[PDB]
Design a protein around this nucleic acid. Structure first.
Lengths: 216, 96, 206, 87, 81, 25, 121, 94, 129
RNA sequence: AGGGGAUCGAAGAUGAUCAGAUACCGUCGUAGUCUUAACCAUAAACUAUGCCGACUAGGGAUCGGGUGGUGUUUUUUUAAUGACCCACUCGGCACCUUACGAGAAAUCAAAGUCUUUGGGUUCUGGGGGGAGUAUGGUCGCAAGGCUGAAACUUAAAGGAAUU
């Protein structure tokens, strides 16, 4: 019992919602961290690196450390968190504590004959965070992942197994490339494909159906 | 648009424009002008023998206060004064 | 379709055109309000009553659509409609807020200014632009009272009326109070009028 | 999508916008869901029937949704003279 | 607004914008018939004359050149055609 | 790095070099 | 610098919203009454909280202000005692001769035709 | 770099240049479009006008002012305390 | 000037989707445009369009759909061999499951898959998806 | 090379202040600042944003023209003209709120319609110095202009914003 003061936290506590497909479907906002980890407790975590950054004061140097970290299980779900803290111990936990909130699913598609399980993206996507952009190309079966080690682990924990990658600008900015890649894998679902050309019933949100479990 | 022409029968216009543009390379320029052949003291050679005439005590730049014990060597085929640097410790007496 | 019981009845029209609400904004016009109707000289505009009433019953349908009336919130920073919001808070749930709208009402999950709405209504988008801008961060549809030159962006349902006239803002607040009660079942007397009159929702200087 | 022998795939099939017919992002915070009731000739709206129109974040950004909900309502039959296709 | 009727626009809007910007090309100029007082002498005068036309009888100039239309004389019975 | 005065000095050097050239030819 | 601080201000309006009809304009019995309210440690601070509390109580006698709630700011008696100011507002007044003479209004709105004069200018 | 338009010159023509008036910081103004500060100060300052009115041989009449159209405040009036340095709220007026 | 009539018509299409419009006015209604717009209805990519004709050039009113993503014209007139069509769709097409880059042969105007069926190649205009 | 040569005024002559001041500051003062016939072909010659053509969120003001409303005025109220009002149009110089979009940001109704990369065309640049320098050509009375390197040296030069 974590006494959810919000509305979505009560829904996940009551057990009415058993998966995060529909909240992703309805784009309802998420501001609580436990829903992601309680629903997905098997995700793996790792930290790219630590960037020391300081703010100049009148006396001495007042320095912090910049930490970025990717969250998400190996099945189509992945997130990122960008944060800095006065010490490296709290930066990684402060990195992950906000990384769970921005978790987005993936548009895993096929490269040919759509025979086996999904392996790559269904379309090429782009993402521009700053002056650096990343171009993702669907890759044939067993072609592996062709990217720099800083970004190649993003694809590995994103649930995808082989995507051709292209980049522009200075890629040494790891946090910009990480977010540019993140923007790319979020825009891949923004592509309209003939398989979605059929209309949908547009189901109602479960919050309206389960509005009887409010605060009072 | 976007600068360079995009015409079907315009090939020669941006072909010559390409030639003037690649003229600005450091690689393209000295490859044909023969700077490594007419100005360099090696004549396009990876290695060359020579005769040591005297030694030098040239200092270093900032912030290092040291001397590398350089030596002066004269070539044979070309024949111009050239400075050389002793690689390892204790070899100055072997290149006296 | 509608059962034709929400037409332009004389009883709701006599008070509607007796409160100079038919006039619009000045010669400045926005294409989000195509309700221009043979613009009057001196630069003032005239809106058509039919579309305002038809969208007003539609807006009342939105409020009655929610199952829990508590989440309904009305935003008003202008001094004319402050008393209207608190008065509308008694007939239904209608969680009110007047004066300075606190920033981050929907966000900031620890503050005592927590709001968990589903529908929020703004009397004038120009003054309460913060509420509408914030409502797009928590996935909450907004209803707005927009004139012919008001900033009607970020709006789902716009009610064309005069937000500068003292009588008009309180008048529209009174009508939507009746209809939301009528569609909720509390007002069984569909044909009979409502006992309380319109100038209930009128702020005064003392 | 669907592969050859069944095995339903493409989890999280998203709703499509009802105004300009494009897809919306799962993290798109500018998209809202609007429900409209229906009164069956009794003077009070019966709950349980709510037509759901999808308003994308783009139509919200341009402020055209205010002049859009009348378009879809009149096409359904909820409005009579609010919307006029002729210009 | 994203839905507009460019196929069948309202005639009030069509007859207001510039002629080159309408749905179809059409001039706003028109012909007319004017009588010089006295003899009938049926003639047709186009509104944008840019000239001082006169009847075949004598110097009976009815319209004067102007930047826009032609300024008709004080005594003229012109009928829309 | 005053462009104007270093530029003027460059023209003075041009003058001197032209004089040196004209001494022989 | 004779300026009050929030330390005495947080305790003051807390006293007013809960313990208003206990004190009076008096000063020394206000000090004595402070002992009969939630315990306060320093007597020096007691000299200021009593001095502040009567200061707002001089202001309220000439018109109550914001930030106070002692069940008469929450009077709520017919809103501002005007509740339903009907006095036949939607009739009478000018409806005896019928009002809304107007110009270019529902007279040219062809949805329906209502009464009242339609010729002004 | 601030000062998009610098001054109000968007068209062409270059105008001309007039001398700067009693500044000791006179220079070529960037065209006639500068800070103006036109002055309508009276010939006689406030007070001491009662003596002038009494000493007038004829009654009423007089009381005109100096009508000086000034172009003297240009890029140096901060020394003369006329044009105030400001910040990103400079969007007021031009 | 009016160099490529295809540029303005196809570009004027491109702006109208990203702003979410419903109809587009198209000029100057050439034979290679009307056939360009003709091969989408059979694939359900644009819907229906109207041809209002005047004596000078005519005008096209295009009623579009949101299923479309992006359309363009490749300039200049490029030459395509039988060993080049698969090269082009692997270059500027997101995938082969969707999107049909089109081209014209001596026998009218078709798409890349349809021309692959033709066993013949030809002249390329642009891409549609 | 002539005319003119009043004010200002490269040089210069003086008087300051300054340790030093042929600089800032005061007064004179030649060439010049004006024009004629012939050269000079340069600038932060900037909107640092090439030209042509099409589309894209709005509003207001303004220049020139035009259209309609017994419009308000001007007399010989009224015929007219012209001054303006209202509504709109074309061509513009341009502004105000926002950013669907771009940009590293400053910002941009284009610096947008560029990885979802392709409307047509011309010119320029591949690290900073050396150096717009050497030489070779070319025009110019001269001063100068156009074209235009190399050797050698360095790991930094430069742009937008933050504390």
């Amino acid at each position: 019992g974590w006494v959810p003061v919000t509305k979505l936290g009560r829904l996940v506590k009551a057990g009415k919602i058993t998966t995060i497909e529909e909240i992703f479907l309805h784009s309802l906002p998420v501001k609580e961290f436990q829903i992601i980890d309680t629903l997905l407790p098997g995700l793996q975590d790792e930290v790219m690196n630590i960037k020391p950054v300081q703010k100049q004061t009148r006396a001495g140097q007042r320095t912090r450390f910049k930490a970025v970290v990717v969250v998400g299980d190996s099945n189509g779900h992945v997130g990122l968190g960008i944060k800095t803290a006065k010490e490296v111990a709290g930066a990684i936990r402060a990195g992950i504590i906000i990384a769970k909130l921005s978790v987005i699913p993936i548009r895993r598609g096929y490269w040919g004959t759509n025979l086996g399980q999904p392996h790559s993206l269904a379309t090429k996507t782009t993402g521009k965070c700053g002056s650096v952009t990343v171009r993702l190309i669907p890759a044939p079966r067993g072609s592996g992942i062709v990217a720099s080690p800083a970004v190649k682990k993003l694809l590995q924990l994103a649930g995808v197994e082989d995507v051709y990658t292209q980049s522009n600008g200075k890629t040494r900015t790891l946090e910009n490339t990480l977010k540019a890649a993140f923007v790319a894998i979020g825009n891949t679902y923004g592509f309209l494909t003939p398989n979605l050309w059929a209309e949908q019933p547009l189901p109602v949100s479960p919050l309206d159906i389960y509005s009887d479990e409010a605060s009072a | 648009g976007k600068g360079k022409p995009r015409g079907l029968n315009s090939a020669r216009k941006l072909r010559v424009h390409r030639r003037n543009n690649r003229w600005a390379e450091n690689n393209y320029k000295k490859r044909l002008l023969g700077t490594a052949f007419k100005s360099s003291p090696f004549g396009g050679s990876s290695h060359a023998k020579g005769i040591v005439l005297e030694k030098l005590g040239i200092e270093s730049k900032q912030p290092n206060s040291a001397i590398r014990k350089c030596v002066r060597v004269q070539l044979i085929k070309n024949g111009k004064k050239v400075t050389a640097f002793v690689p390892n410790d204790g070899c100055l007496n072997f290149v006296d | 379709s509608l059962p034709a019981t929400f037409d332009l009845t004389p009883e709701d029209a006599q008070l509607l055109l007796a409160a100079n609400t038919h006039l619009g904004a000045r010669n400045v016009q926005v294409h989000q309000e195509p309700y221009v109707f043979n613009a009057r000289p001196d630069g003032v505009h005239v809106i058509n009553v039919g579309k305002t009433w038809e969208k007003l019953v539609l807006a009342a349908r939105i409020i009655a659509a929610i199952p829990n009336p508590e989440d309904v919130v009305a935003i008003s920073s202008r001094t004319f409609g402050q008393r209207a919001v608190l008065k509308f808070a008694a007939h239904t749930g209608a969680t009110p807020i007047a004066g300075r709208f606190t920033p981050g009402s929907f966000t900031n999950y620890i503050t005592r200014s927590f709001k968990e709405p589903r529908l929020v209504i703004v009397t004038d988008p120009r003054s309460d632009a913060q509420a509408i801008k914030e409502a797009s961060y928590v996935n909450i549809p907004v209803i707005a009272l927009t004139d012919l030159d008001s900033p009607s962006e970020f709006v789902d349902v716009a009610i064309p009326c005069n937000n500068r006239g003292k009588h008009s803002i309180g008048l529209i607040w009174y009508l939507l109070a009746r209809e939301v009660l009528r569609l909720r079942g509390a007002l069984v007397d569909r044909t009979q009028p409502w006992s309380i009159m319109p100038d209930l929702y009128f702020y005064r200087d003392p | 999508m669907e592969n050859d022998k069944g095995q339903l795939v493409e989890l999280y099939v998203p709703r499509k916008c009802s105004a300009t017919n494009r897809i919306i992002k799962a993290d798109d915070h500018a998209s809202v869901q609007i429900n409209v009731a229906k009164v069956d000739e009794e003077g009070r709206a019966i709950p349980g029937e709510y037509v759901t129109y999808a308003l994308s974040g783009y139509v919200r950004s341009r402020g055209e949704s205010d002049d859009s909900l009348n378009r879809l309502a009149q096409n359904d039959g909820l409005l009579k003279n609010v919307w006029s296709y002729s210009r | 607004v994203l839905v507009q009727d460019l196929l069948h626009p309202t005639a009030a809007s069509e007859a207001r914008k510039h002629k080159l910007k309408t749905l179809v090309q059409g001039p706003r100029s028109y012909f007319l018939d004017v009588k010089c007082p006295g003899c009938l002498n049926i003639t047709t005068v186009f509104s944008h004359a840019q000239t001082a036309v006169t009847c075949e009888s004598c110097s009976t100039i009815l319209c004067t050149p102007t930047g826009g239309k032609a300024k008709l004389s004080e005594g003229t019975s012109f009928r829309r055609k | 790095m005053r462009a104007k005065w270093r530029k003027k000095r460059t023209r003075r050097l041009k003058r001197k070099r032209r004089k040196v050239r004209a001494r022989s030819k | 610098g004779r300026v009050r601080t929030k330390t005495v201000k947080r305790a003051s309006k807390a006293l007013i919203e809960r313990y208003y009809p206990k004190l009076t304009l008096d000063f020394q019995t206000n000090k004595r009454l402070c002992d009969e309210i939630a315990t306060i440690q320093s007597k020096r601070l007691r000299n200021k909280i009593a001095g502040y509390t009567t200061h707002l109580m001089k202001r309220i006698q000439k018109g109550p202000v914001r930030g106070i709630s002692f069940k008469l700011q929450e009077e709520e008696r017919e809103r501002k005692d005007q509740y339903v100011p009907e006095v036949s507002a939607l009739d009478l007044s000018r409806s005896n001769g019928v009002l809304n003479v107007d110009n270019q209004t529902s007279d040219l709105v062809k949805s329906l035709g209502l009464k009242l004069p339609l010729s002004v200018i | 770099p601030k000062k998009r338009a610098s001054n109000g010159r968007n068209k062409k023509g270059r105008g001309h240049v007039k001398p700067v008036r009693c500044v000791n910081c006179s220079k070529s103004i960037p065209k006639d479009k500068a800070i103006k500060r036109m002055a309508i100060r009276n010939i006689v300052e406030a007070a001491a006008v009662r003596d002038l009115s009494e000493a007038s041989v004829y009654p009423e009449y007089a009381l005109p002012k100096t009508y000086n159209k000034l172009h003297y405040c240009v890029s140096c009036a901060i020394h003369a305390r006329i044009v105030r340095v400001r910040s990103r709220e400079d969007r007021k007026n031009r | 000037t009016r160099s490529s009539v295809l540029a303005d018509a196809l570009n004027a299409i491109n702006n109208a989707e990203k702003t979410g419009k419903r109809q587009v006015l198209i000029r100057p209604s050439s034979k290679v445009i009307i056939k360009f717009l003709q091969v989408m209805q059979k694939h359900g990519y644009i819907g229906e369009f109207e041809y209002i004709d005047d004596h000078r050039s005519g005008k096209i009113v295009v009623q579009l759909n949101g299923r479309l993503n992006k359309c363009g014209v490749i300039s200049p007139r490029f030459n395509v061999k039988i060993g080049d069509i698969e090269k082009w769709t692997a270059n500027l097409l997101p995938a082969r499951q969707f999107g049909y880059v089109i081209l014209t042969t001596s026998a009218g105007i078709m798409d890349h898959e349809e021309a692959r069926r033709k066993h013949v190649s030809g002249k390329i205009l642009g891409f549609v998806y």
